[PDB]
Design a protein around this ligand. Structure first.
Ligand SMILES: [Cl-]
Ligand SMILES: [Cl-]
Length: 312
């Protein structure tokens, strides 16, 4: 339907590639991580790991998967615990290290010794933590409009409790999602193909799993707010490519910030330059006219930059 209802683990919503699952135990819980694993026709000898944003899923990478597999990469796209088709635990203490370790464990089981890691938005923050933890196993890091290029709390963004994130998140609607995404993701543009991703998210808040979805969303908002990576960008040991749509204005808590602080948050035109300065081996690629999700807003241009930036 036009306002579809999806389950707690995105039951009813199809990814464009076959979905696999890995069962494991963490923090005393049985958990399941969904992932895509796509092989190239002719292997180039490299493997790519793709990490979704907070509000997107492994499936939202579909065009990037097609492009990279066609270029000869093995492509793995994983749904983190708390997200999408993976488990929504009743209880979990989230950290970027814990999620990175869960992912590292999956890559071990998939036989991957080393990968090039691409993270969008929250996935970028996570990819950063992954790269800090496992540098010998990350040959190249790519961050696509990552969050975490400024430490919001340190700028004066007011803290919100897990409980208050939870109550706020239960109000999520497709109308509200679209208002946010058209402005922040796509630089005021909209195309009908963007609607699939809005309804993917909105439909989880319609079903029987909506409280579990909201609770995990609250725990992961808390993780993003309390556990910055920005101070350690100077520790990154491999070449890092920053692909930044400069119309992005993403910042945690920007709507509860006073006007004077709103005006200063999420300035991606500056945040990219700042990150490039601090990362030892950085290459910055700016797209002046694209927003938070350049890979969806302008797929051909984004993919041409990414393929070239991945080359050794
Ligand atoms: Cl704080
Ligand atoms: Cl160190």
């Amino acid at each position: 339907s036009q306002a579809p209802v999806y389950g707690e683990r995105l039951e009813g919503f199809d990814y464009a590639y076959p979905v696999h699952y890995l069962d494991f135990t963490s923090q005393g819980q049985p958990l399941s991580m969904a992932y895509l694993d796509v092989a190239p026709k002719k292997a180039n000898g490299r493997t790519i790991l793709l990490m979704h944003g907070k509000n997107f899923c492994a499936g939202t990478w579909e065009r990037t998967i097609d492009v990279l597999a066609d270029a000869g990469y093995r492509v793995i796209a994983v749904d983190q615990v708390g997200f999408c088709k993976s488990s929504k635990p009743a209880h979990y203490q989230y950290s970027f290290q814990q999620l990175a370790a869960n992912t590292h464990a999956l890559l071990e089981r998939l036989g991957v010794a080393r990968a090039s890691v691409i993270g969008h938005s929250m996935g970028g923050m996570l990819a950063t933590r992954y790269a800090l933890l496992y540098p010998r196993q990350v040959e190249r890091l790519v961050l696509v409009n990552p969050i975490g290029l400024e430490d919001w709390k340190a700028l004066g963004v007011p803290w919100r409790s897990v409980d208050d994130w939870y109550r706020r998140d239960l109000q999520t609607s497709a109308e509200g999602i679209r208002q946010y995404q058209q402005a922040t993701y796509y630089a005021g543009e909209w195309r009908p193909e963007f609607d699939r991703w809005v309804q993917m998210q909105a439909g989880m808040y319609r079903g029987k799993g909506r409280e579990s979805v909201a609770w995990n969303s609250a725990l992961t908002y808390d993780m993003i707010f309390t556990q910055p990576v920005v101070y350690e960008l100077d520790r990154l040991q491999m070449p890092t490519l920053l692909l930044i749509g400069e119309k992005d204005n993403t910042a945690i808590g920007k709507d509860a910030a006073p006007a004077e602080l709103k005006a200063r948050l999420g300035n991606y035109a500056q945040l990219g330059k700042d990150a490039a300065r601090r990362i030892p081996q950085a290459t910055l690629v700016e797209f002046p006219d694209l927003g938070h999700t350049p890979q969806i807003q302008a797929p051909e241009r984004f993919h041409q930059a990414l393929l070239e930036g991945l080359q050794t």
